[PDB]
């Protein structure tokens, strides 16, 4: 599901992008409710795959290397 212009960048080049209404993962803090409508905040995440409702109900788990978001 699309919401809030969800982009994925990396140094050499941006990783990915989209609008994801829900991003299903557990923040480095802890379980992170996939949501549109979260506030201005700073985050980082370890490597791993996070399903996300991204544009038009397209929810996918995407492995990470560790990185910041």
């Amino acid at each position: 599901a699309m919401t809030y212009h969800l982009d994925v960048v990396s140094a050499e080049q941006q990783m990915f992008s989209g609008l994801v209404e829900k991003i299903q993962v557990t923040g480095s803090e802890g379980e992170l409710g996939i949501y549109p409508g979260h506030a201005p905040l700073l985050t980082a995440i370890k490597p791993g795959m996070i399903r996300i409702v991204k544009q038009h109900g397209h929810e996918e788990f995407i492995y990470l290397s560790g990185g910041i978001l």
Partner: protein
């Protein structure tokens, strides 16, 4: 006389002091609702029903105290 005097003292004791616990507890819950919604606005329709459930359970403890108070006053 002594029994009637004891009823009125007992009614004051059971009514007021125990009801302080929900006066505080209902407020604790609404403070959690306000702080949770301020931190994450999208979670409002999920946690508002939790706040209502929780307020009613906290309010039931004084209503028990008030019940004993009214029994002492009128039963």
């Amino acid at each position: 006389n002594l029994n009637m005097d004891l009823l009125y003292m007992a009614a004051a004791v059971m009514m007021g002091l125990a009801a302080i616990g929900a006066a505080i507890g209902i407020g604790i819950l609404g403070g959690k609702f306000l702080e949770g919604a301020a931190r994450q606005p999208d979670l409002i329709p999920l946690l508002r029903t939790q706040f209502f459930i929780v307020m009613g359970l906290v309010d039931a403890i004084p209503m028990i105290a008030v019940g004993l108070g009214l029994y002492v006053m009128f039963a």
